[PDB]
Amino acid sequence: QGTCFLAKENQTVLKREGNDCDQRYSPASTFKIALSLMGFDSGILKDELHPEWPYKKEYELYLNVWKYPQNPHTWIRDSCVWYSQALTRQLGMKRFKGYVDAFHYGNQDVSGDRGQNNGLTHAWLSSSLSISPTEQIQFLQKIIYKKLPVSQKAYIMTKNIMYIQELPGGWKLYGKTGTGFQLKLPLQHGWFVGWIEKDERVITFAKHIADSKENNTFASFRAKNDALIQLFNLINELEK
Amino acid sequence: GTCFLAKENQTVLKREGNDCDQRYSPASTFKIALSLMGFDSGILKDELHPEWPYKKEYELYLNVWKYPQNPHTWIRDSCVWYSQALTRQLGMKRFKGYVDAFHYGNQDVSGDRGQNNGLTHAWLSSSLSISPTEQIQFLQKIIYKKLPVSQKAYIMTKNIMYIQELPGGWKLYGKTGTGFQLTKDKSQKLPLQHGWFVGWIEKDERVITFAKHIADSKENNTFASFRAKNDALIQLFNLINELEK
Structure with a gap:
């Protein structure tokens, strides 16, 4: 149990709510933000629509939207994990670790799960890699x-x-959800992180929630829903 | 009570909750109807025209309403004063003609009881009411x-009315709206919110219309519009998963 909502403009912390803003958690699919940077920088990813890769082993796909060909645009939109893993396999661990350290991303631990040697494709999936809302x-x-x-x-x-939608006042919203599992029933924790931008202003934000009990809905969706209310409220204060 | 409806062409894909045939004020979901009247009448010209300025006589329930408004920002900001400037320009003869021709809910634009303000208030916790089914x-x-x-x-x-792209490539169009449930003869508002999120999702040649409504039984710590949209977005994601099988 515990939440955090952080909002920061340049060096100014505008909002800090909840008790968990310095607690590290697995990034889950919010790590796609870092993977995107690696993908385009390395040249593996070309543009919003290229490369398009086909899906394999559909029996292990828990969401039907993942059962279609994917490109960088759909990858983020559908939060398609298998596209992430195909990308890191192409990168290789040397370059993967190189980017993680260059980004100083959370605890920078890409060793993965014990007995699995799976850091390259699982480090960000409720595993070794961990990042706080502040981070x-x-x-x-x-x-x-x-x-x-x-x-x-x-x-x-x-x-x-990463573009999502336009918020009141013309603040354009960029961001990414992600749900992980705390380490019996599944105990979720959920992220929504990103930024809003208007004219020359950018406000970065991070929302996290950690369930104490099993839940009817993905924690990321609840985090995004709560965060959007908090951003609506912040925009109103900012525009006074 | 709640309702969630989703319909593709003639197929009702989802009908959940017990309140789907009860009429409620459309609140800001009526901006959908106003948009059609505005562009058809020629008062509204395109997504960025006309731009109207804020005036201090307008009430600022949201600070973003203090900036100049056009059809795009009107929907995005849910700017009530722009709606009212539009209906004042339309006039009652055109307004009533569209409401009746659209067969919009109870079609009652008489306004608040005893006030002669239907042109600018009929859809705001007032005379006009529409069910989720309608x-x-x-x-x-x-x-x-x-x-x-x-x-x-x-x-x-x-x-x-465009909002965003959802998983699977379904483009989301829609509008929230919150009102206050009224006493029996609508002479007073009660502190009980009710909230809407209505619209449609579209992919290739497929369009699914939807309507979500929530009626509170007691005061609530969260704005009803936000709860209705937030619940509806989860239900649409789950529906999309079925559609994409």
Whole structure:
């Protein structure tokens, strides 16, 4: 149990709610933000629609939207994990670890699960890699202010495929959900992280929730839903 | 009580809850109907025109309403004063004509009891009421072009109601709205919210209209519009998973 909502504009913390803002958790599918940067920077990923890769082993697909061909745009939209894993297999562990350290991403632990030698494709899936809400903000701001050693194309294409919608006031919303499992019934924890931008202003945010009990719905969706209310409220205060 | 309806062409894919035939004020979901009237009448020109300025006589329930508004921002910001500036320009003869021709709910634009304000208040916790089932009926008339409006009215309304792309490539169009449940003769508002999220999702040639409504039995710590949309988005995701089998 415990939540966090952080919102930060440049060096200014505008909102800090909840008790968990310095607790590290697995990033789950929010790690696709970092994978996008690696994919476009390495040249494995080309643009919003290329490359398109086909699905394999459909019997292990728990969401029907994953059973179609995927490209970087659909990858983020559908949160398609198998596309992430095909990408890291192409990158290889050396380059994968190189990017994780260059991004100073959370605890930077890509060793994976014990007895599995599966860090390359599982480090971010309720496993070794762990990041706090404060550390999500730190990473996202390095994207926003282009402080990372990656190409201009990596920044632009990552931004393009993270776009979600326009919020009141014209604040454009970019971000990513992710659900992980706390380590019997499944105890979820959920993220929604990203930023909103209007004119020359960018506000980075991170929302996390940790369930104490099994739940009817994906924790990421509840985190996103709560976060959007908190962002609506913040925008109203900002526009006074 | 709640309702969730989803309909693809003539197929009712989902009908959940017990409140699907009870009429409620449309609140800001009525902006969908106003959009069609605005573009058909020519008062609204395109997604960015006309731009109208805020005036201090308008009430600022949201600070984003203090900036100039056009059809795009009107929907995005749910700007009530822009709606009222539009209906004042339309006038009652045109307004009533569209409401009746659209067969919109109870078609009652008489306004607040005793106030002669139907033109600017009928849809705001007031005389006009529509059920979730009737919202689907109205939305289907937009999708299949059964309304007496121009081709441009349909296209521009769709353009400004766009929200986002959902998993599977389903594009989401829609609008929230919150009102206050009324006493028996509508002489007073009660502190009981009710909230809507209605619209449609579209992929290739498929369109599924939907309507979500929630009626509170007691005061609530969260704005009803947000709860209705948040619940509806989860239910649409689950529906999309079925559709994509």
